[PDB]
């Protein structure tokens, strides 16, 4: 609505975590989650 927000509110990814053998965090940044109208302006391709 107003106060567009578009920021993380709920965390349903996983209920809990007990043992962690690895961790990594990137630098702070800000990504625009605001919706857009029209065609798809971004393309992301990943190989794992």
């Amino acid at each position: 609505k107003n106060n567009k927000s578009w920021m993380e509110s709920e965390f349903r990814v996983y209920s809990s975590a007990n043992n962690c053998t690895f961790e990594y965090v990137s630098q702070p940044f800000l990504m625009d989650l605001e919706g857009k109208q029209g065609n798809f302006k971004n393309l992301r391709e990943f190989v794992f």
């Epitope: 609505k1 107003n2 709920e10 209920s15």
Partner: antibody, heavy 119, light 113 residues
Framework: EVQLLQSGAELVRPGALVKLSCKAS????????MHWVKQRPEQGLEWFGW????????IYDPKFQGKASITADTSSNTAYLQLSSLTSEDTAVYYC????????????WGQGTSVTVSS | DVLMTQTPLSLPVSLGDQASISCRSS???????????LEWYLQKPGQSPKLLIY???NRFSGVPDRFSGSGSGTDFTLKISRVEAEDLGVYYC?????????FGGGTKLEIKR
């Protein structure tokens, strides 16, 4: 009518802690947010924080940061607020709110618990 | 850290009259979808606050039809078409949004005589 059940009153000495219960009635707590409030006659209502039973995320007002932690019991659909490191200024009536009917617009409030910090 | 002030502090209204409680907010919470994140409450003497109106323009279920909220921008008011004895209490404004929630000072209602 959805209602939240809380303890009538609590008697706590300075420096000790209390645990305020908030039992769900007529709804499943897991599907709705839970909120807590502090009230004293001189200032009125003061917002404490909110908890998400299904996500576990909690937000606390700076006025109460470091004094309390919010949790809940999924099995009994009961929300708990722990009030520790209490002093005379913490004497207040505490309420819990939740059951927004699958919308972030509504909530239902219990009768409230009168917490007095005295010897 | 939202700041709001409720005017008037108190107001007596005789049975059958209309009550008006206004609140001013330091942040705009008016939305283009027709809803406004400000919940109205009534705290009857000796009872906990009870929700009256949710999102300003939508009446809460189980509340008498006399209760209805309206306003825009940062100024909003609660209108009671006809007031009764059971309406006695303190009316509070409750801003919503995705930021730490805030409470108002409250407005007291009395039955005029």
């Amino acid at each position: 009518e959805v209602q939240l059940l809380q303890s009538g009153a609590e008697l706590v000495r300075p420096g000790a802690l209390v645990k305020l219960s908030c039992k769900a009635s007529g709804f499943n707590i897991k599907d709705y947010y839970m909120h807590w409030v502090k009230q004293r006659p001189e200032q009125g209502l003061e917002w404490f924080g909110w908890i998400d039973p299904e996500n576990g995320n909690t937000i606390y007002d700076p006025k109460f940061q470091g004094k309390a932690s919010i949790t809940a019991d999924t099995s009994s659909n009961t929300a708990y607020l722990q009030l520790s490191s209490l002093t005379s200024e913490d004497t207040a009536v505490y309420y819990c709110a939740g059951s927004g009917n699958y919308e972030d617009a509504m909530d239902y409030w219990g009768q409230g618990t009168s917490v007095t910090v005295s010897s | 850290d939202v700041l709001m002030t409720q005017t008037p502090l108190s107001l007596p209204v005789s049975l059958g009259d209309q009550a008006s409680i206004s609140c001013r907010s330091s942040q705009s919470i008016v939305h283009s979808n027709g809803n406004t994140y400000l919940e109205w409450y009534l705290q009857k003497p000796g009872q906990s606050p009870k929700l009256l109106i949710y999102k300003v323009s939508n009446r809460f279920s189980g509340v008498p039809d006399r209760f209805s909220g309206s306003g825009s921008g940062t100024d909003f008011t609660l209108k009671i078409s006809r007031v009764e004895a059971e309406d006695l209490g303190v009316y509070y404004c409750f801003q919503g949004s995705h930021v730490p929630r805030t409470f108002g000072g409250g407005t007291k209602l009395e039955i005029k005589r």
